[PDB]
Structure 1
Amino acid sequence: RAATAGVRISHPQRLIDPSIQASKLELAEFHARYADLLLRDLRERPVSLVRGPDGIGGELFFQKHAARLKIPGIVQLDPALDPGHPPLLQIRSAEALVGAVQMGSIEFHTWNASLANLERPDRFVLDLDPDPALPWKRMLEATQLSLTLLDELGLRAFLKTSGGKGMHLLVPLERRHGWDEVKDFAQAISQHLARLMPERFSAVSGPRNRVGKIFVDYLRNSRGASTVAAYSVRAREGLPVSVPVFREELDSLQGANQWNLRSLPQRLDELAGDDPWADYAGTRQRISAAMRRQL
């Protein structure tokens, strides 16, 4: 089990994605090999799991709480954090991560807060959701415009492909605000973009409210909500991965799912050390009165 963080994998050969002949064992080995990359995000944050017992061809189970986990190493959080439900979950090691895969996990989504203080978010996320028939160039243009607004506000933003059809923007924040304040700030940004360019942006959820447009989703900033982790796999055809990218290579991207679990190694080799999110951990910023004025 040297390639699976010491974890025994049952039914190693069952297929997670038949389209590319990716097995459960391959998926486990991927998480063992890149455990450190995924932990850059999961290590100190509660995590929600997307489990697919029968592969992407079957149905998915989105789990937030668990009464009796069977993942050696998985941490069960205090119920007081979410009364009326079993304990939340946290993965802090490669063993726990691979153990989750052994139990059917395919995707890992994390909270916008860390164990240091789960009542004060340390980031907010903007998820650009396009019309299922909108040209890719529209997403690129929308992402560029969103980054421009963030720069005017004075906030550093870190982007990554979602692995699906859109782009994710993560904005770190000092733990000085409560959940409602951060969510309202994110909503303010969405609404602002929707007012400036109503032909491109929408601040209202629902596909019927973004026909031929892009929805700047701010709803994942609610307490308990989560966003797919950087470098994590998506339970979709080809097993694409959510990949952090430089703003400079934004216009060179062709799709939100251009990288997958098997092409990630090549991506990392091409970068050869270059880290798109190198300045993430060192970023120190907070919601200011000036920011609110601009919105």
Structure 2
Amino acid sequence: ATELDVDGVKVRFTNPDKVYFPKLGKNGTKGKLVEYYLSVASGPMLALLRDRPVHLQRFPDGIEGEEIYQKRVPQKHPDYLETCVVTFPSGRTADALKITHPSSIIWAAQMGTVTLHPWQVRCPDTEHPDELRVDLDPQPGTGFKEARTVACDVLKPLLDELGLVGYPKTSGGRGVHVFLRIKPQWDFIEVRRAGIALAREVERRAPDAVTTSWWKEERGERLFIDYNQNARDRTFASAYSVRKTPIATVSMPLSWDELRNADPDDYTMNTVPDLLAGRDDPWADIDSVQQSLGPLLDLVAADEERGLGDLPYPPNYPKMPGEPPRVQPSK
């Protein structure tokens, strides 16, 4: 129906009045979603996603229709788009959409993408993450207040003690995501081991409130630090992505002070653009220092001296032919 000029690249856009979020009515159309992404796709969202391969969580007929989690780029796609070869945990490879320009994000939205799921690597170095992900995930009986509390009161002081800087965002669900920008010199195995040592230390400092137990039955009313989010090919909403919630919540980057009193429902595709106006980017300095895993990998070796090694991968998580044997779940 229309051709959009997205930072000098023309992008085809159709069906503006298709309803994606039925509780929002007029405010929950595909047009309002694309309008939201147009509002953020040329700002800090692009910088955070630049050169990353992404997977697309698509809802072509709204969040109550069928869901298509798209990893490989479709065999037929616009000429300008760039792709990057990603390696799945089986060893299989595929051409994934690479975010190189605001038009990349708007094309995704035109295809019904509600949520972008970026890899933790930058192309071309798909071997070494430049990001360690801390996923504070409330289990049944807990919610966002537990997540923000542990994030601000336990995790942030620990990072300060280690000489590390973390950047938090709401997940858009009940949880909190914290990013550590790191030098891309460690592979997925070592970044994940570093995240496990960090998770174990947060758990030691707040054992009544935090768990790393692989078995959900053993977790109780605690936050799970999902250490397996640093494995390959795990869903993880990008900063500024809209989520599959009834009110179209957005994964919102915040400062540590904002997070302390934050409510994730405050940030939606209808509220975020006005909230960003005049406000300093709390993640403005994230790329300013590429940090070493040195402190966390020392914690890993220390844990090995306590008799604490690797933790199990997610259930049925594929493995590569020559990959070292993994730790199996207990019982």
Give the structure-2-normalised TM-score: 0.81
Moved more, 165-174 or 184-193: 184-193
Q: Provide Cα deviations, 1:233-283, integer angstroms capped at 9, x if missing partner.
A: 112111111111111122221x233200110122112xx141101110102
Cα 1:266/1:12, change in 2 over 3 Å? closer
SS in 1 for 2:251: coil
The answer (yes or no) to whether the contact 1:160–1:169 under 8 Å persists in 2 is yes
Q: Rate the CA distance shift 1:69–1:202 in 2: closer, same or farther, 3 A.
A: farther
Is the 8 Å Cα contact of residues 4 and 32 (structure 1) preserved in structure 2? no
Q: What residue is the counterpart of 2:39 in the other structure?
A: 33
RMSD: 2.2
Structure 1 stretches of 4+ with a deviation exceeding 6 A read none
Aligned match for 2:19, one of 7, 12, 15 = 15
Conserved in 1, the CA contact under 8 Å of 2:141 and 2:222? Answer: no
Equivalent in the alignment of 1:186: 195
Distance 1:103 1:41, change over 3 A: same
Aligned to 1:47: 54
Which runs of structure 2 are paired with 1:264-275 in the superposition (5 Å)? 264-269=272-277, 272-275=278-281
2:147 and 2:138 map into 1 onto residues whose CA distance is 7
The residue number in structure 2 matching 1:111 is: 119
Aligned to 2:298: 292
8 Å CA contact retained: 1:32, 1:98: yes
Match of 2:145 among 116, 130, 137: 137
Instruction: Give the gaps of 5 or more residues in structure 2.
Output: 304-331
Match in the other structure for 1:276: 282
* 160-169 or 138-147: bigger deviation: 138-147
Q: Which letter does structure 2 place at the counterpart of 1:98?
A: I
- Of the three residues 137, 140, 154, the one matched with 2:163 is 154
Alignment partner, residue 120 of structure 1: 128
> Any idea what the Cα deviations from partners look like across 1:88-122, whole Å, max 9, x if unmatched?
22122222221111112110011111114111111
Structure-2 separation of matches of 1:44 and 1:290: 26
Task: Look up the match of 2:234.
Answer: 225
Give identity over the alignment, percent: 29
Shift of 1:67: 4.4
CA–CA separation in structure 1 for the residues paired with 2:118 and 2:13: 24
Of the three residues 246, 260, 264, the one matched with 2:255 is 246
* CA distance 1:67–1:189, shift in 2 (3 Å): same
1:210 aligns with 2:219: yes
Figure out how many residues of one structure are paired with residues of the other and give that number.
291
Aligned to 1:78: 85
**Distance change >3 Å, CA 277–CA 289, structure 1 → 2:** closer
Report the residue type matching 2:77 in the other structure: K
Q: 1:288, 1:184 → 2: CA distance? A: 12
Cα distance between partner residues in 1 of 2:271 and 2:74: 36
1:176-218 CA deviation, whole Å, 9 max, x = no partner?
2121111001011112222332211111345434321000112
> Contact 2:39 / 2:273 at 8 angstroms: preserved in 1?
no
Partners of 1:115 and 1:106 lie apart in 2 by 23
CA contact (8 A) 2:197 2:296 kept: no
Q: In structure 2, what residue type is equivalent to 1:211?
A: G
Gap runs ≥5 in structure 1: none
State the TM-score, normalizing by the size of structure 1: 0.90
How far the C-alpha of 1:3 sits from its partner, in A, is 5.3
Q: Which amino acid aligns with 2:159?
A: L
Asked if structure 1 preserves the Cα contact closer than 8 Å seen for 2:83 and 2:96, the reply is: yes
Deviation at 1:155, TM superposition (A): 0.9
1:39 counterpart letter in structure 2 = L
Q: Measured at CA, do residues 238 and 3 of structure 1 come closer, stay the same or move farther in structure 2, by a change above 3 Å? A: farther
Q: Deviations over 1:126-150 (max 9, x none)?
A: 1111124325432222112111111
Distance 2:80 2:159 in 1: 39
Distance of 1:290 and 1:15 partners within structure 2: 46
